[PDB]
Enzyme design. Structure first.
Site, mmCIF file in Angstrom:
data_model
loop_
_atom_site.group_PDB
_atom_site.id
_atom_site.type_symbol
_atom_site.label_atom_id
_atom_site.label_comp_id
_atom_site.label_asym_id
_atom_site.label_seq_id
_atom_site.Cartn_x
_atom_site.Cartn_y
_atom_site.Cartn_z
ATOM 1 N N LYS A 93 16.253 9.586 6.996
ATOM 2 C CA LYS A 93 17.310 9.950 6.046
ATOM 3 C C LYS A 93 17.102 11.402 5.578
ATOM 4 O O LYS A 93 18.066 12.142 5.485
ATOM 5 C CB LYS A 93 17.332 8.982 4.840
ATOM 6 C CG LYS A 93 18.374 9.346 3.778
ATOM 7 C CD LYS A 93 18.260 8.534 2.496
ATOM 8 C CE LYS A 93 19.255 9.006 1.461
ATOM 9 N NZ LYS A 93 19.468 8.001 0.390
ATOM 10 N N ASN B 225 39.082 -20.339 43.623
ATOM 11 C CA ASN B 225 38.711 -21.609 44.265
ATOM 12 C C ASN B 225 37.945 -21.300 45.552
ATOM 13 O O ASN B 225 38.330 -20.376 46.285
ATOM 14 C CB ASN B 225 39.945 -22.460 44.543
ATOM 15 C CG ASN B 225 40.610 -23.020 43.295
ATOM 16 O OD1 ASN B 225 40.018 -23.765 42.520
ATOM 17 N ND2 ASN B 225 41.872 -22.698 43.089
ATOM 18 N N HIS C 46 32.655 -7.147 47.495
ATOM 19 C CA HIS C 46 33.457 -7.252 46.248
ATOM 20 C C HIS C 46 33.074 -8.498 45.448
ATOM 21 O O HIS C 46 33.925 -9.336 45.104
ATOM 22 C CB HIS C 46 34.961 -7.182 46.557
ATOM 23 C CG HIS C 46 35.326 -5.912 47.269
ATOM 24 N ND1 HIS C 46 35.246 -4.688 46.634
ATOM 25 C CD2 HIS C 46 35.678 -5.709 48.561
ATOM 26 C CE1 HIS C 46 35.574 -3.786 47.545
ATOM 27 N NE2 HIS C 46 35.850 -4.354 48.719
ATOM 28 N N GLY D 72 30.009 -2.118 55.362
ATOM 29 C CA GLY D 72 29.960 -1.599 54.000
ATOM 30 C C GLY D 72 29.481 -2.642 53.010
ATOM 31 O O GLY D 72 29.740 -2.525 51.811
ATOM 32 N N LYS E 149 0.781 -1.270 0.000
ATOM 33 C CA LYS E 149 0.000 0.000 0.000
ATOM 34 C C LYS E 149 0.816 1.327 0.000
ATOM 35 O O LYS E 149 0.409 2.263 -0.701
ATOM 36 C CB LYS E 149 -1.047 0.069 1.149
ATOM 37 C CG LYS E 149 -0.531 -0.360 2.530
ATOM 38 C CD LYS E 149 -1.671 -0.605 3.526
ATOM 39 C CE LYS E 149 -1.122 -1.133 4.830
ATOM 40 N NZ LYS E 149 -2.100 -1.013 5.943
HETATM 41 O O1 JLN Z 1 18.494 4.103 -1.492
HETATM 42 C C1 JLN Z 1 18.484 3.909 -2.729
HETATM 43 N N1 JLN Z 1 18.714 2.717 -3.095
HETATM 44 C C2 JLN Z 1 17.970 1.999 -3.957
HETATM 45 C C3 JLN Z 1 16.630 2.053 -4.481
HETATM 46 C C4 JLN Z 1 15.438 3.061 -4.126
HETATM 47 O O2 JLN Z 1 15.683 3.950 -3.193
HETATM 48 O O3 JLN Z 1 14.256 2.973 -4.768
HETATM 49 N N2 JLN Z 1 16.484 1.069 -5.381
HETATM 50 C C5 JLN Z 1 17.503 0.370 -5.520
HETATM 51 N N3 JLN Z 1 18.524 0.940 -4.651
HETATM 52 C C6 JLN Z 1 19.980 0.471 -4.474
HETATM 53 O O4 JLN Z 1 20.859 1.204 -5.490
HETATM 54 C C7 JLN Z 1 22.113 0.456 -5.661
HETATM 55 C C8 JLN Z 1 21.973 -0.214 -7.007
HETATM 56 O O5 JLN Z 1 21.686 0.740 -8.061
HETATM 57 P P1 JLN Z 1 22.749 0.992 -9.248
HETATM 58 O O6 JLN Z 1 22.321 -0.124 -10.017
HETATM 59 O O7 JLN Z 1 22.556 2.197 -10.112
HETATM 60 O O8 JLN Z 1 24.053 1.284 -8.496
HETATM 61 C C9 JLN Z 1 21.996 -0.799 -4.679
HETATM 62 O O9 JLN Z 1 22.680 -0.284 -3.637
HETATM 63 C C10 JLN Z 1 20.407 -0.970 -4.386
HETATM 64 O O10 JLN Z 1 20.225 -1.075 -3.133
HETATM 65 N N1 AMZ Z 2 39.795 -28.957 41.041
HETATM 66 C C1 AMZ Z 2 40.363 -27.687 40.904
HETATM 67 O O1 AMZ Z 2 40.736 -26.849 41.912
HETATM 68 C C2 AMZ Z 2 40.516 -27.327 39.441
HETATM 69 N N2 AMZ Z 2 40.154 -28.026 38.308
HETATM 70 C C3 AMZ Z 2 40.492 -27.276 37.203
HETATM 71 N N3 AMZ Z 2 41.108 -26.099 37.629
HETATM 72 C C4 AMZ Z 2 41.585 -25.033 36.802
HETATM 73 O O2 AMZ Z 2 40.350 -24.344 36.323
HETATM 74 C C5 AMZ Z 2 40.573 -23.761 35.000
HETATM 75 C C6 AMZ Z 2 39.285 -23.986 34.296
HETATM 76 O O3 AMZ Z 2 39.143 -25.452 33.976
HETATM 77 P P1 AMZ Z 2 38.073 -25.858 32.895
HETATM 78 O O4 AMZ Z 2 38.791 -25.508 31.652
HETATM 79 O O5 AMZ Z 2 37.765 -27.275 33.196
HETATM 80 O O6 AMZ Z 2 36.854 -24.870 32.963
HETATM 81 C C7 AMZ Z 2 41.944 -24.407 34.391
HETATM 82 O O7 AMZ Z 2 42.979 -23.562 34.989
HETATM 83 C C8 AMZ Z 2 42.091 -25.549 35.396
HETATM 84 O O8 AMZ Z 2 43.421 -26.199 35.570
HETATM 85 C C9 AMZ Z 2 41.100 -26.141 38.962
HETATM 86 N N4 AMZ Z 2 41.606 -25.087 39.785
HETATM 87 N N1 AMZ Z 3 39.362 0.906 51.174
HETATM 88 C C1 AMZ Z 3 38.633 -0.201 51.062
HETATM 89 O O1 AMZ Z 3 39.073 -1.415 51.364
HETATM 90 C C2 AMZ Z 3 37.239 0.106 50.544
HETATM 91 N N2 AMZ Z 3 36.714 1.345 50.164
HETATM 92 C C3 AMZ Z 3 35.458 1.113 49.755
HETATM 93 N N3 AMZ Z 3 35.127 -0.247 49.881
HETATM 94 C C4 AMZ Z 3 33.834 -0.892 49.538
HETATM 95 O O2 AMZ Z 3 33.796 -1.034 48.054
HETATM 96 C C5 AMZ Z 3 32.419 -1.147 47.582
HETATM 97 C C6 AMZ Z 3 32.348 -0.291 46.338
HETATM 98 O O3 AMZ Z 3 32.707 1.107 46.676
HETATM 99 P P1 AMZ Z 3 32.447 2.154 45.547
HETATM 100 O O4 AMZ Z 3 30.976 2.303 45.348
HETATM 101 O O5 AMZ Z 3 33.186 3.402 45.997
HETATM 102 O O6 AMZ Z 3 32.981 1.557 44.213
HETATM 103 C C7 AMZ Z 3 31.492 -0.734 48.806
HETATM 104 O O7 AMZ Z 3 31.261 -1.931 49.607
HETATM 105 C C8 AMZ Z 3 32.510 -0.047 49.715
HETATM 106 O O8 AMZ Z 3 32.091 0.084 51.137
HETATM 107 C C9 AMZ Z 3 36.199 -0.861 50.342
HETATM 108 N N4 AMZ Z 3 36.231 -2.267 50.606
#
Ligand code: JLN
Ligand code: AMZ
Ligand code: AMZ
Ligand code: K
Ligand code: K
Lengths: 516, 517
Positions: free
Chosen positions: B137, B421, B278, B308, B66
């Site tokens: 555009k 770990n 953290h 905190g 359309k």
């Molecule tokens: O925005 C405009 N693009 C449009 C339109 C239209 O706006 O009606 N029709 C075809 N195209 C596009 O134009 C390019 C191809 O055209 P040519 O063959 O001349 O290069 C290609 O990039 C096609 O996409």
């Molecule tokens: N059982 C464990 O503590 C253990 N098993 C695997 N790993 C370490 O975890 C890492 C991720 O292992 P994976 O690739 O399976 O996800 C690789 O460093 C691997 O040696 C571990 N620390």
């Molecule tokens: N100096 C620090 O060890 C310390 N300063 C801020 N914080 C904690 O770090 C977290 C993120 O702080 P921020 O929103 O400023 O990134 C919040 O729990 C905050 O109390 C800490 N652990």
């Protein structure tokens, strides 16, 4: 199978690569080619007959060439419905079995540094409308959006058409390319065309797409499945790493390699980082070699380096590979490997050996959360307080040049350790790391216990201020000579007094380096 | 700035349409519309030009084509800054549109209730997005509005003699965001439903998503970093959609901690309270008595670390609990709701961020970005074969009494949220010692014992991964732990089982691992 013989094809392509080859193929098979402007000239200049779109529509300011019902009715008529077929027949409109379109390269016009007006001009209207119409009508029409699929077209032509399954797949791909094109147009308009006032660090809308690289061994645990995806637009990272050896990468292998890569490039000097569960168990720098940096990093915590992930910020030598081969290592990532190093690492069957592109500093970091996303500026260790020249000596004698380079090392190394973090270091190597603690004094206790005998005379870094003196007292009682932390507590002078009482050199940076 | 003379309207949602149309008509604007939009306007007596009059093309293919006509799109796309384009329109007999109001059928919102493949395919709008993109555009001439939210802005623009160029640029930018969102939804559905891959793949070949900025945060992970919060309008509400009822602005860490505490609390069926520091729990506890009892037990685990902290309850926070939380330094409290008077008790402390979040829906996918890409995985829902205690293997010692077993299940489920770990020492549905984020398993066991103290003697323990060597289990056994649960799976399992046999410790093997980072 749902094969439909190709009789009429609609071709309108910006990029004319492989067009003449395709057109020859179609024409020889008795396919009528219906085309626009320069696409039609390219085909006709070869002697191949081509029906202009203007002959189909009976309408001639350029920008609206294919946006006509005598084009779109031929694309959108559901030929499974008798009433649609009858409507085409009554209007004297024939259907298109094949639609070949590639869009105005918008992202490339932006990438070439063209003006606002030039980029806006390269927003294709007709092209996406033709692609979406043919994709919606995939039970009848086949839509090709890349010259890569042209041999697939000539093959389908020889086979009596595309199958229904082939047409569904093409429609699905067509809609992916339109979504990628629109993400690019929306992203550029937000940034360049209509930015916020005052300019904001993060835009009001954020969109991105990725393409699956591989299925991983498993997710964080074996009962979980996982996949790796790459961002084709982004600068190469771990997702684009080349695997030269070993078993398949798991989810954890990739997160650990990414964490080890970042920890190694956090240092200017030759650096090796050994990671365990996204945390360093050993980091070291060297002015001698990569091998010396790896030995120093491994000797920090040999028990934890078991099954570790190694990253070097320089080429891995044969000397280093020989030592790595004697240790249980899961992954090794480096910008490259010296002649013969890969053969030494290949002595162990399973170790994943990766080559990655050196990182690009100053990016944005994405952190998904339930129901949304957190976006932040990445911590590049370039805050005013990260420069040792801007540190405040709170107590004790100024650090000698060797003590200061160790403090800068411990300070920069504390960024990669998950919070609360304490890094005890000496001679450009970590000797004790206290990671991921729910309180600062337990992280100090941890680093001291691990450091053992090596703690005496060493330096320490705290990623956040000491809220109470006990954390600093823990380090001072163990024989740490110099300590560096942000400062900033209302209780700072109690902490400074405890270091003064112990005869410890204390530096305040005013910069914090939490990491989770 | 351009006076509005002709407006093109085609909206699925007719909210505020009659008020907009009466505003436009009163200002002498010609409304060009089709279908049910045109009827809604005309039924009020407001004159409306049908699209069919403009094109002069008959009623074919169930309206599929359309508005895809040059008398529509030439009016939208003519660059009126070029005299040539303005001259072309006169030679063809086509007038320009200053205003384009288009709202599409809610595709994304209805994929879950899509009757069939054919019905969802039929709902794909062609003409609508083409009109929106064409007007966007040609923003130097045309104004494009895609939401009834902007109707107030249109009426205001009618009063001031049109939209400004800057306003039209902004509208075009928003229009392309909505088009991109629509296409992400169509592409995602086709990949999943229309053309999925064979054999069955858990994650598709293409993945796309967009988010809308909710707010700027206090700062990022550290004050020298800026950060913003974004929401996914398609997703089930989570922490990004939480309602803040009190306190200072949320930081990046406040949100990551709240998300980790929320997940840790909903990892338990019973009334549960988790206290995070953290992204790690410093205390977790369940209660069959009340939320207040669950919070006291979890706080008692490690009161020095709860300072905190970030608190999450998997049930409504009571007045009794708020009264104890008010005496403790707390950064954030997140709950599915608060009892009458609990918020007022929490508001006695100025800064505490009080949040209300929607209960989570289990079984989703998790995104983990990495340099140059993304990792996607199934979330650990603690529903593996080995997560059922009935499927555990008793490797040594006497079978756990009912009270010892429920504590083992608690410690086991609690070990999932602790970063690896991890070692969780627990008793009476509460953690007594947590060893988190360690680069080696034996140090995690040492931490849990040192923190647990006197409470460890007679308690149970859980290990999120197998003990690679017996030392980590010997650490727990030497401290008085009676029962231990771990996955098993090492070539050295029998050495670990022998060490527990030597100590007279009950040992269970699950065959399921629960790492978390
Ligand atoms: O925005 C405009 N693009 C449009 C339109 C239209 O706006 O009606 N029709 C075809 N195209 C596009 O134009 C390019 C191809 O055209 P040519 O063959 O001349 O290069 C290609 O990039 C096609 O996409
Ligand atoms: N059982 C464990 O503590 C253990 N098993 C695997 N790993 C370490 O975890 C890492 C991720 O292992 P994976 O690739 O399976 O996800 C690789 O460093 C691997 O040696 C571990 N620390
Ligand atoms: N100096 C620090 O060890 C310390 N300063 C801020 N914080 C904690 O770090 C977290 C993120 O702080 P921020 O929103 O400023 O990134 C919040 O729990 C905050 O109390 C800490 N652990
Ligand atoms: K850190
Ligand atoms: K865990």
């Amino acid at each position: 199978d749902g094969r439909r013989p190709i009789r009429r094809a609609l071709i309108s392509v910006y990029d004319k690569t492989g067009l003449v080859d395709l057109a020859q193929g179609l024409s020889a098979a008795g396919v009528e080619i219906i085309s626009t402007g320069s696409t039609a000239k390219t085909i006709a200049d070869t002697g191949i007959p081509v029906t202009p779109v203007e002959q189909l529509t009976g309408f001639p300011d350029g920008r609206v060439k294919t946006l006509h019902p005598r084009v779109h009715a031929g694309l959108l008529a559901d030929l499974r419905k008798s009433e649609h077929a009858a409507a085409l027949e009554q209007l004297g409109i024939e259907a298109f079995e094949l639609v070949v379109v590639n869009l105005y390269p918008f992202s490339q016009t932006v990438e070439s540094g063209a003006s606002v007006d030039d980029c806006v001009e390269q927003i294709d209207i007709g092209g996406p409308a033709m692609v979406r119409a043919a994709a919606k009508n995939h039970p009848s029409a086949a839509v090709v959006t890349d010259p890569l699929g042209y041999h697939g077209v000539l093959a389908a032509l020889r086979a009596g058409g595309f199958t229904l399954a082939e047409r569904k797949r093409l429609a699905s791909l067509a809609f992916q390319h339109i979504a990628e094109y629109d993400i690019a147009v929306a992203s550029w308009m937000q940034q360049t065309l209509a930015p916020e006032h005052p300019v904001a660090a993060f835009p009001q809308w954020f969109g991105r797409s990725w393409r699956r690289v591989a299925m991983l061994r498993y997710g964080e645990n074996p009962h979980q499945q996982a996949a790796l995806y790459g961002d084709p637009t982004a600068w190469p990272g771990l997702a684009q790493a080349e695997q030269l050896h070993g078993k398949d990468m798991s989810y954890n292998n990739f997160t650990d390699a990414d964490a080890a890569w970042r920890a190694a490039f956090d240092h200017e000097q030759t650096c090796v980082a050994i990671i365990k569960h996204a945390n360093p168990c050993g980091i070291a720098i060297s002015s001698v070699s990569v091998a010396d940096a790896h030995r120093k990093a491994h000797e920090c915590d040999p028990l934890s380096a078991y099954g570790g992930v190694i990253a070097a910020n320089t080429e891995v030598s044969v000397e280093m590979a020989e030592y790595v081969s004697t240790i249980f290592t899961e992954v090794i990532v480096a910008p490259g490997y010296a002649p013969g190093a890969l053969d030494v690492l290949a002595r162990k069957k399973n170790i994943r050996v990766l080559v990655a592109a050196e990182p690009l500093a100053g990016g944005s970091e994405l952190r998904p959360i339930s129901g949304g996303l957190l976006i932040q500026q990445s911590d590049q260790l370039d805050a005013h307080g990260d420069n040792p020249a801007n540190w405040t000596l709170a107590t004790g004698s100024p650090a000698d040049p060797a003590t200061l380079t160790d403090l800068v090392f411990a300070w920069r190394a504390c960024r990669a350790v998950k919070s609360n973090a304490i890094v005890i270091a000496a001679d450009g190597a970590t000797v004790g790391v206290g990671m991921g603690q729910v309180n600062r004094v337990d992280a100090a206790r941890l680093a001291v216990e691990r450091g053992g005998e090596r703690v005496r005379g060493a330096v320490a870094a705290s990623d956040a201020f000491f809220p109470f003196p006990d954390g600093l007292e823990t380090l001072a009682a163990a024989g740490v000579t110099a300590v560096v932390h942000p400062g900033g507590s209302v209780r700072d002078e109690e902490v400074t007094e405890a270091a003064a009482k112990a005869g410890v050199t204390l530096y305040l940076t005013g910069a914090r380096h939490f990491a989770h």
